[PDB]
Design a protein around this ligand. Structure first.
Ligand SMILES: [Mg+2]
Ligand SMILES: [Mg+2]
Length: 534
């Protein structure tokens, strides 16, 4: 409903698609030559890899990059001997950790005096401190120093921004402003890329090949996004739930963003469409678990989602029948689609995993219906189930032909700690961010309200407490992401890391949280409407 119409009618010239692809293919060997150069050091190769990451362009060379870093990491102690450049050490820290190599925080010892810890002379180094700030979001639970580093960097950068010399380099100033407001690893890959392109263009001595490559890459990525939204909108319109149901929310863009966060690349296009269809469908189910549904209505709804059928008829009312029918028809359809691609098992798991979510949803509704506000601790035992991150991860795997159904869904039902930590991040981010919407519906049982009631604290203070629980679990996600490398396929692990980054994007608001719709409006047109001028 009105970005709907927009994408329904936007003109997508296939000729332009083809030309973008062609020019990307043509430039690719030149960029790969840069990576494989015998003439550059390990250090220079890491700088390049960082730049490719920054520009959303590393995935074209993932094989080569992973191998370069696997070798380079074994020589890491050697490489940093005598390396006292803050930006360099910090760039290395980002790259190895992003790639599942736990570079030690001891590398930062050299920038620390004997105390406070971080050296005050690290302030002529504005570029170095920017990267230090950035990598302060790549900590492990035990790594207390990162939080020290985050504060150090922010304070001194804030002072630099405030104004003397700041002005003399506007483009740099703006970039640092953007980073402090939205840290790279509190942002999603493609938006990081879109902004870095603008920054890098203004950098004296920027590589012209890499810049152009990055622009072509973004425009090509964006073409897929617009086509995906076009496809989604047509599909949603045909389904026509708006006719048969009174309360259909507008979740088109948010739902696409629900696939784009997890993976931005062109080859996960199908994966994004599948994830977006499932999310848009499950929103309607979620909306149906409403305090204003009666005890019998929710009992029968929940039972039908246990049986995965279609009443019988010994059953209930029209709009609810319509919801159950639609969910089963959509999942049945998606399963039919993926069957030739050998992915029907994964589609089947969607409603299998939702079974316990429905049961949990039933309890939330009972609380909401009677106006019971449980303790925050009792709430969370139910809330972590409704968060369903094992379900969400499952949605993303369906469209990934580079992921064995057997390994992925085996991993998932082993209940990985990382899916457990993501459940906490989502549940808390969602409940705080959508609070006033929750209160204006009858949904009085939520993480914020339950915390406020337990500790007699105010909305603001509760919020700040939940934030800290969120940050702890984010650090857990990072640790699990690194730890699980060479045990769990990297393409699986990156979805998980990207869930964390997407949740920051959508719900965090300074010290946070807020509704996704307002955050999306900030980057809507840059992502989904306007291409980069070539
Ligand atoms: Mg609900
Ligand atoms: Mg909620």
């Amino acid at each position: 409903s009105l970005w709907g119409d927009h994408f329904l009618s936007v003109s997508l010239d296939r000729g332009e698609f083809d030309e973008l692809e062609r020019e990307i293919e043509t430039m690719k060997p030149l960029v790969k030559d840069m990576l494989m150069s015998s003439q550059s050091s390990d250090k220079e190769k890491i700088r390049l890899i960082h730049l490719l990451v920054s520009l959303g362009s590393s995935y074209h060379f993932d094989k080569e990059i992973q191998d370069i870093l696997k070798h380079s990491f074994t020589k890491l102690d050697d490489i940093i001997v005598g390396e006292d450049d803050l930006e360099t050490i910090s760039i290395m820290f980002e790259v190895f950790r992003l790639y599942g190599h736990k570079m030690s925080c001891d590398a930062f010892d050299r920038f620390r005096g004997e105390d406070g810890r971080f050296k005050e002379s690290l302030a002529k180094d504005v570029r170095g401190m920017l990267q230090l700030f950035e990598v302060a979001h790549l900590g492990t639970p035990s790594e207390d120093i990162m939080d020290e580093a985050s504060s150090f960097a922010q304070n001194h950068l804030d002072s630099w921004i405030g104004g003397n010399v700041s002005g003399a380099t506007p483009h740099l100033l703006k970039h640092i402003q953007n980073s402090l407001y939205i840290p790279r690893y509190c942002n999603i890959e493609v938006l990081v890329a879109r902004e870095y392109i603008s920054y890098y263009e203004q950098e004296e001595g920027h590589n012209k090949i890499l810049l152009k490559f990055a622009k072509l890459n973004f425009n090509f990525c964006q073409f897929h996004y617009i086509q995906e939204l076009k496809t989604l909108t047509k599909w949603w319109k045909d389904l026509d739930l708006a006719s048969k149901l009174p309360y259909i929310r507008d979740r088109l863009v948010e739902s696409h963003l629900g696939g784009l966060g997890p993976y931005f690349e062109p080859h996960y296009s199908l994966g994004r469409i599948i994830v977006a269809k499932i999310i848009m469908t499950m929103v309607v189910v979620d909306d149906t678990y409403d305090a204003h549904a009666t005890v019998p209505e929710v009992a029968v709804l929940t039972e039908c989602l246990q049986r995965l059928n279609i009443g019988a008829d010994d059953k209930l009312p029209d709009y609810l029948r319509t919801v159950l029918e639609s969910v089963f028809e959509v999942m049945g359809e998606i399963e039919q689609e993926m069957r030739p691609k050998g992915r029907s098992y994964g589609v089947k798991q969607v409603l299998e995993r939702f079974k316990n979510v429905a049961k949990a949803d039933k309890q939330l509704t009972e609380w909401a219906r009677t106006g019971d506000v449980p303790s925050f601790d009792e709430y969370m035992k139910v809330g972590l189930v409704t968060a369903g991150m094992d379900g969400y991860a499952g949605y993303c795997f369906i469209g990934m032909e580079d992921v064995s159904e057997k390994e992925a869904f085996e991993w998932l039902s082993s209940n990985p700690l990382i899916i457990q930590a993501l459940n906490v991040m989502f549940r808390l981010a969602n409940d705080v961010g959508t609070y006033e919407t929750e209160i204006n519906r009858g949904e009085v049982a939520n993480g914020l309200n339950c915390y406020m009631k337990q500790y007699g604290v105010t909305k603001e203070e509760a919020s700040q407490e939940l934030r800290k629980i969120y940050s702890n679990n984010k650090k857990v996600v990072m640790e699990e992401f690194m730890n699980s490398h060479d045990h769990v396929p990297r393409q699986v692990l990156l979805r998980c890391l990207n869930f964390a980054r997407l949740f920051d994007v959508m719900y965090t608001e300074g010290d946070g949280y807020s509704e996704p719709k307002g955050k999306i409006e900030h980057f809507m047109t840059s992502l989904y409407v306007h291409p980069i001028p070539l």
